C-alpha cells in the first residue's frame, strides 16, 4: 500500500519557512499510530526540517544530491524507486513530493485543520469524484490541542 499522510488547513497550506505553521500534538500522535513499523518517504527539505529520522520506522529520503548521507536514513534519487520499497509506504511530504505522487497513491490519511495559517507551500487540490471517504472523525480538543481538526481517510475510487 502506498499512502499519503498530510495535515493541511482550510486553505490547504501545509508549511511556512520549512516548518509546520501550527503545533498540534494530536496530529503527531496520529502520525505515530499510522506509521510505526512502516516506511516513510520524505523529500529532502522535509527531512531537514525534522532534522533526524523518526524512531521505529524505516526512513527513506528523496534527493538528487549524490553525496547525501545520514545515519539511519536510506536515500533514493527518483520517484521510480518508491515503487521498489516493500510493505506499507507513506509519502510524508513536502509539497514537491505530494504534487508528484497524489495521482499515484492508493489512499490518503489527511488531518484537516480548522484554521487559516499563512503558508508558502500547499497540498494539491483533491476532489470528491477521485476519492471516496473511508472514514472521517473529529480529533479531541484539550489544553494542548486547541485547534479543531478532522481525521479523514480517503481511498482512490
Ligand atoms: N503539514 C504537513 O503535513 C507537512 C508539511 N510539510 C512542509 O512542506 C514544506 C516542504 O516542502 P517543499 O519545499 O516542497 O520541499 P520538499 O520537502 O518537497 O523537498 C524538496 C526537495 O526534495 C528533493 N526532490 C523532490 N523531488 C525529487 C525528485 N524527483 N528526485 C530527487 N529529489 C527530489 C529535492 O532535494 P535536493 O534539493 O536535495 O535535490 C528537492 O529540493 C515545509 O514547509 C514543511 O514544513 C512537510 C511534510 C508534511
Ligand atoms: C513528526 O514531526 C513532523 C512530521 C511532519 C510530516 C507530517 C505531519 N503531520 C501529518 N499529518 N502528516 C505528515 N506527513 C512534518 C514535520 O515538520 C515539517 C514534523 O516535524 C514537526
Swiss-Prot record:
Recorded GO CC terms: cytosol
Location of the DHFR domain: 1-156
GO molecular function: dihydrofolate reductase activity; NADP binding
Residues reported in the UniProt entry to bind NADP(+): 6-7, 14-19, 43-46, 62-65, 92-97
Protein keywords: Antibiotic resistance, Methotrexate resistance, NADP, One-carbon metabolism, Oxidoreductase, Plasmid, Trimethoprim resistance
E.C. designation(s): 1.5.1.3
Residues holding substrate: 5-7, 27, 57, 111
Any single GO BP term: one-carbon metabolic process
NCBIfam families xref list: trim_DfrC
Family: Belongs to the dihydrofolate reductase family.
Record protein name field: Dihydrofolate reductase type 1 from Tn4003
Gene name for this UniProt entry: dfrA
Amino acid at each position: 500500500t502506498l499512502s499519503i499522510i498530510v495535515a493541511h488547513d482550510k486553505q490547504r497550506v501545509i508549511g511556512y519557512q520549512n516548518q509546520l505553521p501550527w503545533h498540534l500534538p494530536n496530529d503527531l500522535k496520529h502520525i505515530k499510530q499510522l506509521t510505526t513499523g512502516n516506511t516513510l518517504v520524505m523529500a529532502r527539505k522535509t527531512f531537514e526540517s525534522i532534522g533526524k529520522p523518526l524512531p521505529n520506522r524505516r526512513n527513506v529520503v528523496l534527493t538528487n544530491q549524490a553525496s547525501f548521507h545520514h545515519e539511519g536514513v536510506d536515500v533514493i534519487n527518483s520517484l521510480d524507486e518508491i515503487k521498489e520499497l516493500s510493505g506499507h509506504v507513506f509519502i510524508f511530504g513536502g509539497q514537491t513530493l505530494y504534487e508528484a505522487m497524489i495521482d499515484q497513491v492508493d489512499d490518503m490519511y489527511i488531518t484537516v485543520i480548522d484554521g487559516k495559517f499563512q503558508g508558502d507551500t500547499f497540498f494539491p487540490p483533491y476532489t470528491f469524484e477521485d476519492w471516496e471517504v473511508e472514514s472521517s472523525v473529529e480529533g479531541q480538543l484539550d489544553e494542548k490541542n486547541t485547534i479543531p481538526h478532522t481525521f479523514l481517510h480517503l481511498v482512490r475510487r
